[PDB]
Amino acid sequence: RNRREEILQSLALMLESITTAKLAASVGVSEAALYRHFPSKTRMFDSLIEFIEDSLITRINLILKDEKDTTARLRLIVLLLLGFGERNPGLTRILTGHARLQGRINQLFERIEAQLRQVLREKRMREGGYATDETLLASQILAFCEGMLSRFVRSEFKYRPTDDFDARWPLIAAQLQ
Amino acid sequence: RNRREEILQSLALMLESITTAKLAASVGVSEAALYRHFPSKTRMFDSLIEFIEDSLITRINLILKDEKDTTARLRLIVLLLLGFGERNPGLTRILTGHARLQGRINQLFERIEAQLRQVLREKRMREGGYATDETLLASQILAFCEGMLSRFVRSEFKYRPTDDFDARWPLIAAQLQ
């Protein structure tokens, strides 16, 4: 439980810089034990993407209750995606292609997209909404985020996702009209 | 010359759906001959990316002289990138990661970025310019394009880059103030 996300953290770190025997050891436990959590290396890579996705949602559910204004929530969620990709180069090169189990990656994206989609919806919900389809908008914002994460990896990490974010945000805000 | 881009077209098609013996045959010529153009499979994959990049610039140099207005030039160049990725799924999965020689891919991107960067520059050149660094802007537009190309591949081609472009362009135009 608290130990599974422990095998997943150790996994993300190993990717960063597998071997189920070294990983099991990493977390004071044995292969037999580790395999009782993740019987296949395929299942834990899935759980790893899922772990990222859940962790990412947990960070977003925090924004949605600190900030009530839609533009502010957006600003932070986008900053979370950028910042996450920047802090986790290894994981971000997997979500960006440069590394199947891609249905699970794509699920993670459709997922972050639906959280964006509703933050944009909860705007008309109390303003009975945007002049643009929130589906078109959510996907327009995610495309940027996804494009910034895809540079970074490309430029051999010369371009950091959160560089000049204060100069960029305005460009995105101009799309929320 | 006209025959090299012929080996490169046949290459792009084969990727779409190698083997230097089948490729050579493809173009009524022999391996010996083909190898005198591209001695290494590494050199022609490079020439293939370059071929894409040059072809892409050729299409842009056309826009720059049909349309004189900056927003119109932009609209089309972005539509060319989207449309290109949509017409060439195979090549676009290589530029998107899902396929080293990545310094050459990245060069292609920095390249399309510098063409964007100057179309934005040639705006102040006769209006002595945008309220945003054209470098920040060019890279903001390319990020979107790159993000749309990265979906497409992801969604197993459910999301086409040029879908709803007429509803999206406005969102980008709002970033040119």
For residue A17, the domain's CATH number is 1.10.357.10
- Chain A with chain B: Cβ pairs closer than 8 A: 96
Contact A134, A140 (CB under 8 A): no
Token code pair at residue A5: 């996300």
Experimental method: X-ray
Residues 52-91 of B with CB under 8 A from A: none
User: How far apart, in whole angstroms, are the C-alpha atoms of residue B97 and residue B91?
Assistant: 10
Between the alpha carbon of residue B69 and those of residues B124, B129, B134, the distances in Å are 12, 14, 16
Gyration radius (Cα) of chain A, Å: 18
* Plot region of A101 (φ>0 → left; ψ -120 to 50 → alpha; else → beta): left
User: How far apart, in whole angstroms, are the C-alpha atoms of residue B110 and residue A146?
Assistant: 17
Contact B50, B8 (CB under 8 A): no
Q: What is the resolution of this structure in A?
A: 2.5
Residue holding tokens 């095998």?
A7
Collect all residues of chain B within an 8 Å Cβ-Cβ radius of residue A140: 144, 168, 171
Structural domains counted in chain A: 1
- Contacts for A144 with CB less than 8 Å, ≥ 6 apart: A78, A172, B140, B143, B144, B147
Q: Hey, how many other C-beta atoms are within 10 angstroms of the C-beta on A87? A: 12
Residue holding tokens 């990138």?
B81
Token code pair at residue A11: 């996994």
The range of the structural domain enclosing residue B25 comes to: 1-177
User: How far apart, in whole angstroms, are the C-alpha atoms of residue A100 and residue B173?
Assistant: 37
A156 and chain B in contact, CB less than 8 A: yes
Our CA-based measurement puts residue B157 at a distance from the nearest CA of chain A, in whole angstroms, of 11
